Amino acid sequence: TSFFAHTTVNITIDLGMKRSGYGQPIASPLSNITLPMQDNNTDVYCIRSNQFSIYVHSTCKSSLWDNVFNQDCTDVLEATAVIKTGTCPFSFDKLNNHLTFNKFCLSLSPVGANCKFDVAARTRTNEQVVRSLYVIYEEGDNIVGVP
Amino acid sequence: TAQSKPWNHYRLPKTLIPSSYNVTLRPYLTPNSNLYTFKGSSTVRFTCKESTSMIIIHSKKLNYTNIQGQRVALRGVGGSQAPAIDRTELVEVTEYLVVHLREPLQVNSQYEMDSKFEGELADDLAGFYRSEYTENGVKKVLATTQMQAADARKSFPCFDEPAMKATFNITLIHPSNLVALSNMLPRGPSVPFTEEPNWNVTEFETTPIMSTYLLAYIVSEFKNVQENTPSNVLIRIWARPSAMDQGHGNYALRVTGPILDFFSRHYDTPYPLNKSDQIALPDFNAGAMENWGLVTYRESALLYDPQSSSIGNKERVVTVIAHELAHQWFGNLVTLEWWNDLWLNEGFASYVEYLGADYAEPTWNLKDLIVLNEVYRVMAVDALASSHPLSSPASEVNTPAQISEVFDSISYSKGASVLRMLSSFLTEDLFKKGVASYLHTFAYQNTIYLDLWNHLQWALGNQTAINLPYTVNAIMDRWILQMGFPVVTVDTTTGTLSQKHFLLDPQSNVTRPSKFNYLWIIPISSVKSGTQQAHYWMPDNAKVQNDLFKTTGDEWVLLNLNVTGYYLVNYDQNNWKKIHTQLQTDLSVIPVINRAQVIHDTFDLASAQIVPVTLALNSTLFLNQETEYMPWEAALSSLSYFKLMFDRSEVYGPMKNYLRKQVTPLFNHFEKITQNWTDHPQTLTEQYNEINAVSTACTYGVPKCKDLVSTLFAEWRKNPQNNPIYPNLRSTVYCNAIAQGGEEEWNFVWEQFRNTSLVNEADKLRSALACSTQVWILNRYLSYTLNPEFIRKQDVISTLSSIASNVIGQSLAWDFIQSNWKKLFEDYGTSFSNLIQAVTRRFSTEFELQQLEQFKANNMDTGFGSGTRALEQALEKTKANIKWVKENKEAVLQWFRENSQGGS
Ligand SMILES: *[C@@H]1O[C@H](CO)[C@@H](O[C@@H]2O[C@H](CO)[C@@H](O[C@@H]3O[C@H](CO[C@H]4O[C@H](CO)[C@@H](O)[C@H](O)[C@@H]4O)[C@@H](O)[C@H](O[C@H]4O[C@H](CO[C@H]5O[C@H](CO)[C@@H](O)[C@H](O)[C@@H]5O)[C@@H](O)[C@H](O)[C@@H]4O)[C@@H]3O)[C@H](O)[C@H]2NC(C)=O)[C@H](O)[C@H]1NC(C)=O
Ligand SMILES: *[C@@H]1O[C@H](CO[C@@H]2O[C@@H](C)[C@@H](O)[C@@H](O)[C@@H]2O)[C@@H](O[C@@H]2O[C@H](CO)[C@@H](O[C@@H]3O[C@H](CO[C@H]4O[C@H](CO)[C@@H](O)[C@H](O)[C@@H]4O)[C@@H](O)[C@H](O[C@H]4O[C@H](CO)[C@@H](O)[C@H](O)[C@@H]4O)[C@@H]3O)[C@H](O)[C@H]2NC(C)=O)[C@H](O)[C@H]1NC(C)=O
Ligand SMILES: *[C@@H]1O[C@H](CO)[C@@H](O[C@@H]2O[C@H](CO)[C@@H](O[C@@H]3O[C@H](CO[C@H]4O[C@H](CO)[C@@H](O)[C@H](O)[C@@H]4O)[C@@H](O)[C@H](O[C@H]4O[C@H](CO)[C@@H](O)[C@H](O)[C@@H]4O)[C@@H]3O)[C@H](O)[C@H]2NC(C)=O)[C@H](O)[C@H]1NC(C)=O
Ligand SMILES: *[C@@H]1O[C@H](CO)[C@@H](O[C@@H]2O[C@H](CO)[C@@H](O[C@@H]3O[C@H](CO[C@H]4O[C@H](CO)[C@@H](O)[C@H](O)[C@@H]4O)[C@@H](O)[C@H](O[C@H]4O[C@H](CO)[C@@H](O)[C@H](O)[C@@H]4O)[C@@H]3O)[C@H](O)[C@H]2NC(C)=O)[C@H](O)[C@H]1NC(C)=O
Ligand SMILES: *[C@@H]1O[C@H](CO[C@@H]2O[C@@H](C)[C@@H](O)[C@@H](O)[C@@H]2O)[C@@H](O[C@@H]2O[C@H](CO)[C@@H](O[C@@H]3O[C@H](CO[C@H]4O[C@H](CO)[C@@H](O)[C@H](O)[C@@H]4O)[C@@H](O)[C@H](O)[C@@H]3O)[C@H](O)[C@H]2NC(C)=O)[C@H](O)[C@H]1NC(C)=O
Ligand SMILES: *[C@@H]1O[C@H](CO[C@@H]2O[C@@H](C)[C@@H](O)[C@@H](O)[C@@H]2O)[C@@H](O[C@@H]2O[C@H](CO)[C@@H](O[C@@H]3O[C@H](CO[C@H]4O[C@H](CO)[C@@H](O)[C@H](O)[C@@H]4O)[C@@H](O)[C@H](O)[C@@H]3O)[C@H](O)[C@H]2NC(C)=O)[C@H](O)[C@H]1NC(C)=O
Ligand SMILES: *[C@@H]1O[C@H](CO)[C@@H](O[C@@H]2O[C@H](CO)[C@@H](O[C@@H]3O[C@H](CO)[C@H](O)[C@H](O[C@H]4O[C@H](CO)[C@@H](O)[C@H](O)[C@@H]4O)[C@H]3O)[C@H](O)[C@H]2NC(C)=O)[C@H](O)[C@H]1NC(C)=O
Ligand SMILES: *[C@@H]1O[C@H](CO)[C@@H](O[C@@H]2O[C@H](CO)[C@@H](O[C@@H]3O[C@H](CO)[C@@H](O)[C@H](O)[C@@H]3O)[C@H](O)[C@H]2NC(C)=O)[C@H](O)[C@H]1NC(C)=O
Ligand SMILES: *[C@@H]1O[C@H](CO)[C@@H](O[C@@H]2O[C@H](CO)[C@@H](O[C@@H]3O[C@H](CO)[C@@H](O)[C@H](O)[C@@H]3O)[C@H](O)[C@H]2NC(C)=O)[C@H](O)[C@H]1NC(C)=O
Ligand SMILES: *[C@@H]1O[C@H](CO)[C@@H](O[C@@H]2O[C@H](CO)[C@@H](O)[C@H](O)[C@H]2NC(C)=O)[C@H](O)[C@H]1NC(C)=O
Ligand SMILES: *[C@@H]1O[C@H](CO)[C@@H](O[C@@H]2O[C@H](CO)[C@@H](O)[C@H](O)[C@H]2NC(C)=O)[C@H](O)[C@H]1NC(C)=O
Ligand SMILES: *[C@@H]1O[C@H](CO)[C@@H](O)[C@H](O)[C@H]1NC(C)=O
Ligand SMILES: *[C@@H]1O[C@H](CO)[C@@H](O)[C@H](O)[C@H]1NC(C)=O
């Protein structure tokens, strides 16, 4: 546990895709964001290092009427997570750019959320918002991030 | 005289009243060299109330092993010396065993009667019977019991009258491989039968005082899903091993617990027993029986497959569980002296089933579908001169056959409709208090309907808030002692209400007499321009006046709010229009159940020629702004006859275009809320209107609906094993896909039909194959019927009546039934009536009537068997159909053409 270190935060966003009645790609809200585990808790991860890096791992799955994602996406259904800026003054890309913040915590719960990023699924045809990722930020220079 | 003799009278003599029974039965589930058989041995203890020289007890189909001289042996409890048995005789018609004694019995002295007997464990669905089932190719047979009414005497000699309640000690000698169940839990663990060690002996605890018709004993290799309630009651759901392994009876376990709890608090009476065994039997025609602690059900009414079953099945299981569990208090704890009053037991449960099911699934709002499923269902039959009063004199119900006639829609649905109206004026909390008062005072006893009224009146006396203008007895006497229901016509200009017996035929010959001259005391809740008015009580008088119903200007009145009462409502033309303009200006003002009323009532009044057919069709105009199920179903049900008579006529184009314009908004509504038919709704009512939206939009030519069917069916043809279509929309998509396509589509569904194991899916696919637009495909499908390797025997009548529903198949099927009549009669005449009703349902011309008449003459030597009444009925319907078309074709055409653009 050293403040002066590089912590890589891997945002694993399992994506749930369901085929529509007209064959269109429809993005289920049941898709799940898995933040790195901290304090025996996957719900919230607070950066405790001078240098951080936020990376997104995206997996596509398919369900049918059941809502059980038992298979892999094929054809129109296949898509890749794209974390849209949403209600924030900074993009997910700006964070991994030269951006400085005293405190940065990503939480799946809207409690204390100073801001909220919109996680979406980008099919070749369209990008549809699925879940929302909340961010609690404190302006400062103690912590900064880069590739 | 011989007629006077007590053994030649169907009703039991009240000289001997039984105390308790000791019944030991051994089901032999292996065939005899010649018949499955059961062996029994019973001992009843009775007290003589009036000195008699003969013991008259019920015995049906029981061979008796003679003990000493005669069939029975008589002993005496206390110092009672038992008289000697001179002779024993068996009357077969009245189902009695007459034991003639040499010396008379003594008043208030107790006696005991032993008997050893044997009977046939036949597949009669009556008494101790065998239910045969095939599991994985192995034919397994189980022993179960339906004792309703006369059947208990078939299994053991007993006084089979509901008023003669007793405690029973049931012992079962069964194979060790099979399980033993009864009304109560076993006294101890099963102990092997000493004489034959391949058998076990389960002796059950002593039953509470109860009627012989609520007894049950089942020996089967079934499996269970257990769960102990917070109230310390054991809930077990029993079913075939295959079904329990697939977890089909888990929804039943999820709801049974909450339902018993609700009724415990509602009736303020703790569950009488400690166990609620609920078994699902393969072949159970009865549907369900309220046996106390061993409720037997049909597999379709207890088991729910979440991967294949539609939401319709989820409604059937939760409501039927709520009905048979309500009986455990109202009907089993406090039973009724005779079947003349069966309506109260079944009617009350048929009303409180929706209450209990709402507790289990509160998101569904099931307490509102009682109007649609029970009231509107029974009004169609109660509006005929052939209907019957809810209550008849107890002297009129004697024959076992006369007892079975009490089990009908009037007793169940109109019973519930009359008891829902009571719980409306009485305020429900008072109604609950009276029912609780009744179950506490008359527990473990028998009752008269007066006994419930008395308690519900006393509840009003212990209150000062609710004050009724008449007694509960009198108000309800008008609805239980006379047949039919009233139509309330309100002239809003003068405020004059009128009541008249509503009969759907314009010309009808009511010959049945009434003491109240067909005039009812009607509770009338009303609304004046959206705001609820004071409650009204219209007397048993033809016409009366009250300024509550006197409108001025834009003021409109709407009566029977929520359809609490059992009556039809008619207003003056002006008020109807003001209601119709409100349904267009803004409908939320008028409640959903009353929005269905303005449709059901107007169409029913039009059938009676009280209002023009144009008013009925006018009520279907607000449906372009309606997303609710009840208002839409009430129209689609009434407009089914219009389609049946006009689907092959000049006026179907206008009809289709009107219903297309009115269903287009509904289809687009669900398209939006379901994200292009991906995420389906979660409320029963909404899921039902989605099926109605999809099916209706399609059979009326909505372009998008045809694209949804094509897409869903396309994805299914690829990856056949995993089916994309939602269990609820499968039937519509299947039928449409077959009609929209040709041989390739038909050959697919046929292959899947011949590969499916689930009867649920098989029937959907089989009924879909009848939707083909190809004449040669339909005729081939009709020839598949003749061979039982392609279509099961029991599926033949439903296959033929499905082909007959296709406009192209009506001619093809009528021809097929005429040419193959002998074969069909020789198999289904012994069900067939319904075939001659499905076909001949569209008959509406003089030329079709002539064909039907010529066919009768031609096939007189063969005969019409069960449907002999139906062939005559079809002639009378066709003649009545010819009249309707002649008097309404022009008006219907003009209206549809004028309102083709939909509504504003
Ligand atoms: C199905 O199973 C149920 C049980 O699950 C059976 O119910 C039982 O029925 C028997 C017979 O009626 C009952 O046995 C008798 O009960 C008498 C009263 O017992 C009660 O009071 C006691 C206090 O007084 C109390 O302690 C006890 O718990 C219970 O509450 C009891 O007195 C009897 O025992 C004596 O009497 C016997 C016979 O009566 C004598 O007296 C008369 C009158 O003078 C005389 O004519 C007769 O000849 C006798 O002398 C005698 O045989 C005994 O030796 C003893 O003196 C006896 O226990 C039993 O209590 C019931 N059990 C339950 C739980 O209800 C039911 O009968 C059965 N069905 C059938 C068809 O049998
Ligand atoms: C849920 O379903 C909606 C309807 O789905 C359509 O109908 C069903 C039965 C299927 O056939 C399905 O495949 C159809 O898509 C759907 O709304 C529809 O979405 C599509 C795709 O976005 C729209 O297509 C686009 O239309 C515009 C033109 O709009 C005008 O014309 C249409 C009729 O064609 C009218 O309905 C509109 O009111 C307008 O008058 C086209 O310009 C566009 O193509 C253009 O762009 C592409 C790419 O650059 C070029 O290649 C083309 O040359 C064009 O330049 C599309 O064709 C469709 O209009 C729209 N309909 C409606 C009524 O909204 C919705 O998107 C689905 N939503 C979900 C939950 O996924
Ligand atoms: C995102 O993560 C969520 C959890 O937050 C995942 O949803 C879960 O999915 C699993 C299956 O992968 C579900 O477990 C399954 O339950 C099915 C029946 O339960 C139904 O009802 C519950 C309660 O409402 C729902 O949660 C569930 O989705 C169903 O609607 C079973 O049929 C499944 O069967 C599997 O296990 C059995 C043994 O138990 C095997 O025999 C089967 O073959 C099969 O393996 C399974 O048990 C779990 O209940 C879901 N929880 C939810 C919805 O919160 C999503 O999958 C995930 N989404 C992604 C990946 O995008
Ligand atoms: C004719 O029939 C209609 C329909 O049954 C009756 O109208 C209903 O009245 C009941 C009264 O109990 C309503 O139930 C209550 O609804 C409240 C919310 O009202 C509305 O808003 C929600 C959200 O939009 C809608 O979903 C809902 O349908 C209503 O439109 C709730 O707040 C109430 O909760 C209270 O009671 C429960 C009891 O379990 C408690 O647990 C709660 O804590 C709280 O105390 C309640 O659920 C019902 O919703 C009404 N339906 C509609 C659509 O109007 C008429 O009253 C009836 N009229 C006559 C003449 O009999
Ligand atoms: C966070 O997630 C990263 C992966 O994230 C990816 O990479 C970053 C840079 C971003 O671009 C993201 O968008 C990407 O999604 C994990 O990194 C992986 O760690 C695993 C740990 O097992 C590594 O697996 C190893 O693979 C070795 C083979 O390749 C490597 O070694 C060979 C020589 O042996 C070398 O030629 C090659 O260049 C690699 O260095 C294998 O030998 C070794 O035994 C092991 O299996 C994997 O290589 C890493 N991938 C990358 C690209 O980082 C982090 O582990 C994870 N950490 C946290 C804290 O969340
Ligand atoms: C209020 O309601 C009670 C009945 O409900 C009870 O009280 C309420 C508050 C709740 O606690 C319920 O759970 C209770 O069940 C009415 O009581 C009845 O009153 C009538 C008289 O108006 C009684 O009838 C009389 O009965 C006499 C014999 O009584 C005995 O025998 C009966 C059985 O036959 C038995 O039930 C009772 O307990 C006695 O052992 C008889 O001599 C007399 O001529 C007459 O027939 C009736 O018995 C009472 N029933 C009960 C169960 O109490 C109140 O009258 C009512 N108040 C008002 C003002 O209406
Ligand atoms: C109807 O069915 C009920 C059961 O459902 C029968 O009631 C039972 O009767 C038996 C026999 O009398 C009872 O068993 C006896 O219990 C007593 C008291 O505890 C003694 O323990 C008895 O043992 C002595 O007597 C036997 C026989 O002579 C002897 O072998 C032994 O060595 C002892 O001397 C014991 O057998 C049983 O508890 C009763 N159960 C209940 C719950 O009541 C009832 O008899 C049946 N009636 C008829 C007419 O068939
Ligand atoms: C028929 O009666 C016999 C005898 O009561 C039943 O045998 C019983 O079988 C059950 C299991 O199904 C036994 O439970 C287990 O017993 C063993 C002791 O060997 C113990 O280790 C476990 O804790 C458990 O209790 C039960 O004891 C056994 N009783 C015996 C052998 O006396 C048989 O199952 C019965 N079948 C039916 C349908 O009645
Ligand atoms: C008629 O019904 C039977 C029984 O459902 C169908 O048999 C099934 O055939 C499918 C396709 O071959 C089997 O799927 C399998 O999936 C596994 C992976 O999960 C894969 O490893 C296998 O190679 C195979 O693709 C399925 O196991 C099999 N089930 C059984 C019990 O036989 C048959 O295909 C149906 N024919 C139709 C739909 O016309
Ligand atoms: C009960 O007894 C009747 C006879 O009283 C049995 O019926 C007979 O069955 C045998 C064997 O099939 C036939 O040969 C006789 O002709 C039958 N006689 C009558 C009058 O039916 C009946 O099978 C017995 N039932 C049981 C289960 O014991
Ligand atoms: C059905 O509703 C239509 C209106 O939608 C009624 O037609 C009106 O009838 C009145 C009285 O004759 C005329 O003054 C109006 O001009 C008519 N309006 C239209 C648009 O036709 C019709 O009377 C209603 N029929 C019934 C029996 O209720
Ligand atoms: C049911 O439970 C009660 C206690 O609430 C008990 O007295 C009675 O004997 C039990 N009957 C059984 C076990 O069937
Ligand atoms: C009504 O029935 C009676 C008795 O059968 C009969 O005399 C009378 O003619 C019938 N009237 C009509 C209108 O059918």
HEC per residue, B764-785: HHHHHHHHCCCHHHHHHHHHHH
Determine whether the shortest distance from the Cβ of B118 to ligand 10 is under 6 A: yes
Q: Kindly give, in sequence order, each residue whose CB lies less than 8 Å from that of residue B776, ignoring residues fewer than 6 positions away.
A: none
Backbone angles phi, psi at B44, to 5 degrees: -105, 145
Ligand closest in space to the Cα of B460 = 6
A 10 A CB-CB count for B430 gives 23
Contact A26 B678 (CB under 8 A): yes
Please enumerate in sequence order all residues whose Cβ is within 8 A of that of B564, keeping only pairs 6 or more positions apart, or say none: B420, B421, B424, B523, B525
Answer yes or no: do A20 and B677 touch at CB < 8 A: yes
Reduced to 3 states, what is the DSSP secondary structure of residue B220?
strand
Pair B237, B274 in one domain:
yes
Q: Which of B738, B732, B740 is nearest to B752 (CA)?
A: B738
Report which of B484, B478, B467, B594 is spatially closest to residue B535, judged by C-alpha positions: B467
Q: Are the beta carbons of B492 and B550 closer than 8 angstroms?
A: yes
Tell me whether B710 touches chain A (CB under 8 Å): no
Report how far residue B718's alpha carbon sits from residue B734's, in angstroms, rounded to the nearest whole number: 15
Contact status, residue B351 vs residue B383, Cβ threshold 8 Å: no
Rounded Cα gap, residues B729 and B693, in angstroms = 10
Q: Could you tell me if B418 and B285 lie in one domain? A: no
For tokens 């924030």, name the residue. Answer: A88
**In angstroms, rounded to a whole number, what is the distance separating the alpha carbons of residues B746 and B734?**
10
B530: alpha, beta or left, given left = phi > 0 and alpha = psi -120 to 50?
A: left
Which residue has the CA at smallest separation from atom 11 of ligand 9?
Answer: B721
Answer yes or no: is B511 within a domain.
Answer: no
**Residue A72: other Cβ atoms inside 10 A:** 12
- Which of B248, B284, B291 has its CA nearest to residue B123? B284
- For B418, B515, B851, the CA distances from B512, given in Å and listed in that order, are 20, 10, 35
Q: What are the binding residues of B?
A: 287-291, 323, 327, 346
- Known catalytic residue: B324? yes
Residues in chain B: 904
Q: Residue whose CA is closest, atom 46 of ligand 3?
A: A68
The answer to whether B302 and B249 have CB atoms below 8 angstroms apart is yes
CA distance B21 to B155: 13
**What is the spatial distance between Cα B442 and Cα B290, in angstroms, rounded to a whole number?**
19
Tell me the residue ranges of DSSP E strands in A31-76: 32-34, 44-46, 51-62, 71-72
Whole-angstrom distance, CA of residue B439 vs CA of residue B268:
9
Distance CA B726, CA A65 (A): 6
Measured CA distances, B600 to B104, B197, B619 (Å): 64, 65, 9
Give CB contacts under 8 A, 24+ apart, made by B65-73.
B65/B116, B65/B117, B65/B118, B67/B114, B67/B115, B67/B116, B70/B99, B71/B97, B71/B99, B71/B115, B71/B117, B72/B97, B72/B99, B72/B113, B72/B114, B72/B115, B72/B157, B73/B113, B73/B114, B73/B115
3-state SS class at B540? coil
In this complex, the residue of A21, A65, A66 whose CB is nearest that of residue B676 is A21
Q: Identify the residue whose tokens are 């039927």.
A: B320
Catalytic hit among B161, B324, B361, B633: B324
For chain A, give every domain's residue range: 6-145
Q: Is the dihedral of CA B708, B709, B714, B716 positive or negative?
A: positive
Q: Which domain holds residue B40?
A: 1-221
Cβ atoms < 10 Å from Cβ of B338: 20
What DSSP character marks residue B675? T
- Taking the CA of residue A64 and the nearest CA in chain B, the distance in Å comes to 6
Q: Are B203 and B138 in contact (CB under 8 A)?
A: no
B355 and B299 in a common domain: no
With tokens 């990856």, the residue in question is: B719
Residue B871: φ, ψ to 5°: -65, -40
How many beta carbons lie within 10 A of that of residue A57, not counting itself? 11
- A20 to chain B: nearest residue by CA? B678
Could you give the residue ranges of the DSSP H alpha helices within chain A? 92-96
What is the rounded CA–CA span in Å between residue A142 and residue A51?
9
CB atoms within 10 A of CB B561: 20
If one residue of B19, B21, B22, B206 were mutated to test the ligand 7 pocket, choosing by the most ligand atoms within 8 A of its CB, it would be B22
C-alpha B272/C-alpha B231 separation (Å) is 12
Joined tokens for residue A53:
């890096």
Task: Give all strands of the β-sheet with B557-559 in edge-to-edge order.
Answer: B531-532, B526-528, B557-559
The answer to whether B222 and B278 are in contact (CB under 8 A) is: no
Say how far apart CA B120 and CA B434 lie, in whole Å.
Answer: 45
Which residue in B689, B706, B556 sits closest to B635, CA to CA?
A: B689
**Residue found by looking up tokens 């809502």 in the block:** A67
Same domain, B386 and B458: yes
| CA nearest neighbour of B709 among B722, B726, B721 | B726
Tokens read off for B141:
């047979």
The SS3 call for residue B217 is: strand
Give the closest residue to B362 by CA, choosing from B302, B322, B306, B415.
B322
B612, exposed or middle or buried, with CB in 10 Å at 0-12, 13-18, 19+? middle
> B233, B274 in Cβ contact below 8 A?
yes
Instruction: Tell me the count of A-B CB pairs closer than 8 A.
Output: 38
Q: Report CA Rg, chain B.
A: 30
Q: B531: helix, coil or strand?
A: strand
Q: What is the CATH number of domain A6-145?
A: 2.60.40.3130
Helix B730-740 vs helix B743-753: crossing angle, to nearest 10: 140
Other beta carbons less than 10 A from residue B461's beta carbon: 7
Q: How far is Cα B879 from Cα B858, in angstroms, rounded to an integer?
A: 20
Pair of tokens at residue B873: 């009925």
**For helices B629-646 and B592-607, angle between their N-to-C axes, nearest 10 degrees:** 20
* Pocket lining: B552 vs ligand 13, CB cutoff 6 Å: no
- Three-state SS sequence of B586-634: CCCCCCHHHHHHHHHHHHHHHHCCCCCHHHHHHCCCHHHCCCCHHHHHH
Among the bound ligands, the one closest to the CA of B703: 2
DSSP letter assigned to residue B375: I
Q: Taking phi first (over 0 means left), then psi (-120 to 50 degrees means alpha), and beta for anything else, what does residue B165 get?
A: beta
Is B91 a domain residue? yes
Cite the DSSP H helix spans in B136-197: 152-155
In the block, residue with structure tokens 């008849």: B392
- Alpha-carbon separation of residue B271 from A36, B141, B233, B398, B443 (angstroms): 52, 33, 8, 32, 12
Q: How far apart are CA B10 and CA B6, in angstroms?
A: 8
For residue B744, being part of any structural domain is answered with: no
Chain A residues with beta carbon closer than 8 angstroms to that of B708: 21-22
Ligand nearest to the CA of B170: 7
Same domain, B5 and B66: yes
B697 inside 8 A of chain A by CB = no
Question: Which residues have C-beta within 8 Å of that of residue B538, sequence separation ≥ 6?
Answer: B488, B497, B499, B521, B522, B524, B544
B276 and B404 share a domain? no
User: What's the maximum distance between 2 C-alpha atoms anywhere in chain B?
Assistant: 91
- Spatial CA neighbour of B446 closest among B324, B344, B296, B293: B344
Tell me, what CATH number does B397's domain have? 1.10.390.10
CA B508 – ligand 13 centroid, Å: 9
Question: Residue B151: CA atoms inside 13 Å, Cβ hemisphere, count?
Answer: 20
Q: Report d(CA B260, CA B329) in Å as an integer.
A: 10
* Contact by Cβ (8 Å): B807, B775: no
- CATH number of the domain to which B860 belongs: 1.25.50.20
| C-beta A24 within 6 A of ligand 5 | no
The vertex-B710 CA angle with B708 and B716, nearest 5°, equals 105
Please give the distance of CA A96 from its chain centroid, rounded to a whole number: 14
DSSP secondary structure letter of residue B128: E
User: Which helix or strand (DSSP H or E) is residue B409 part of?
Assistant: helix B409-409
> Distance (Å, rounded) from C-alpha B116 to C-alpha B63?
9
Measured over the CA atoms of residue A128, residue A133, residue A138 and residue A141, the dihedral's sign is negative
Do residues B324 and B347 share a domain? no
User: Could you tell me if residue B800 is inside a domain?
Assistant: yes
Distance of alpha carbon B364 from alpha carbon B2, whole angstroms: 60
Domain assignment present for B731: no
Domain co-membership, B205 together with B246: no
Distance CA B19, CA B169 (A): 12
Question: What is the C-alpha to C-alpha distance for residues B748 and B525, in angstroms, rounded to an integer?
Answer: 56
Experiment used for this model: X-ray
Kind of pairing between the strands at B85-91 and B96-101: antiparallel
Contact A106, A135 (CB under 8 A): yes
User: Do B465 and B369 belong to one domain?
Assistant: yes
DSSP bridge partners of B200? B174, B192
Which residue shows structure tokens 């002639």? B875
Given 3-state DSSP classes, what are the helix, strand and coil percentages for chain B, each rounded to the nearest 5?
A: 45, 20, 35
Question: Do B666 and B697 touch, CB atoms closer than 8 A?
Answer: yes
Q: Tokens 């208030």 belong to which residue? A: B108
Quick check: CB of B79 below 6 Å from ligand 1?
A: yes
Query: In the numeric block, which tokens belong to residue B868?
Result: 């002999």
Phi and psi, residue B218, nearest 5°: -120, 125
The Cα B248–Cα B282 span in angstroms is 13
Nearest by Cα to B455 from B433, B480, B487, B477: B433
Which residue, of B588, B604, B619, is where some domain finishes? B619
Residue B104 located in a structural domain: yes
Question: What SS3 class is residue B727?
Answer: coil
Task: Tell me the one-letter amino acid at B813.
Answer: A
**What does B436-499 look like in DSSP terms, one character per residue?**
HHHHHHSTTEEE-HHHHHHHHHHHHHT-SS---SS-HHHHHHHHHSS-S-EEEEEETTTTEEEE
Domain stops at, among B286, B306, B329 = B329
The partner residue sitting opposite A21, judged by closest CB among B677, B722, B727, is B677
- The C-alpha R_g of chain A, in whole angstroms, comes to 16
Number of structural domains in chain B: 5
**b/e string for A88-97 if b means 16 or more Cβ within 10 A?**
beeebeebee
For B246, list phi and psi in degrees, rounded to 5: -85, 0
Residues B180 and B275 in one domain: no
Which among A69, A81, A39, A50 has a CA at the least distance from the CA of A143? A50
Residue B184 vs residues B218, B280, B434: alpha-carbon distances, Å: 12, 18, 29
Q: Which of B523, B518, B526 is nearest to B571 (CA)?
A: B526
- Return the number of other C-beta atoms located less than 10 Å from residue B81's C-beta: 12
For chain A, the maximum distance between any two Cα atoms, rounded to a whole number of angstroms, is: 54
Q: Which helix (H) or strand (E) holds B672?
A: helix B652-673
Contact check, Cβ <8 Å, A19/B679? no
With the C-alpha atoms ordered B776, B778, B784, B786, is the resulting torsion angle positive or negative? negative
Please give the Cα distance from B902 to B904 (Å, whole number): 7
Closest CA to B352 of B423, B425, B303: B423
Tell me phi and psi for residue B133, to 5 degrees.
-145, 150
Where b means 16+ CB within 10 Å and e means fewer, B701-716 reads ebebbeebbbbbbebb
- Whether residue B809 sits in one domain with residue B861: yes
- Which residues of chain A approach chain B closer than 8 Å at the C-beta? 18-24, 26, 28, 64-66
SS3 assignment, position B547: helix
**Separation between Cα atoms, residue B330 and residue B344, nearest integer Å:** 9
Name the strand (E) or helix (H) holding B797: helix B793-805
Instruction: Among B168, B192, B221, give the residue marking a domain's end.
Output: B221
User: Strand B294-298 to strand B275-281: parallel, antiparallel, or no bridges (unpaired)?
Assistant: parallel
Tell me if B622 sits within 8 A of B903, measured CB to CB. Answer: yes
Look-up: residue for tokens 């879940």?
A131
Chain B residues in contact with A21 by the CB 8 A cut-off are 674, 676-678, 708, 711-712
Size (chain A), residues: 147
- The structure tokens listed for A84 are 């849209």
Let me know whether B46 and B180 are in one domain.
yes
CA of B14 to the centre of ligand 7 (A): 31
Written as six digits, the tokens of B722 are 């995993």
A18 and B677 in contact by Cβ < 8 A? no
DSSP symbol at B59: -
B residues 669-688 lying closer than 8 A (beta carbon) to A: 674-680
Cβ–Cβ under 8 Å, residues A80 and A115: no
In our burial notation (b when 16+ CB lie closer than 10 A, e otherwise), range B638-657 reads bbeebbbbbbebebbebbbb
- B191: number of Cβ within 10 Å: 10
Sign of the alpha-carbon dihedral angle for B892, B895, B899, B900:
positive
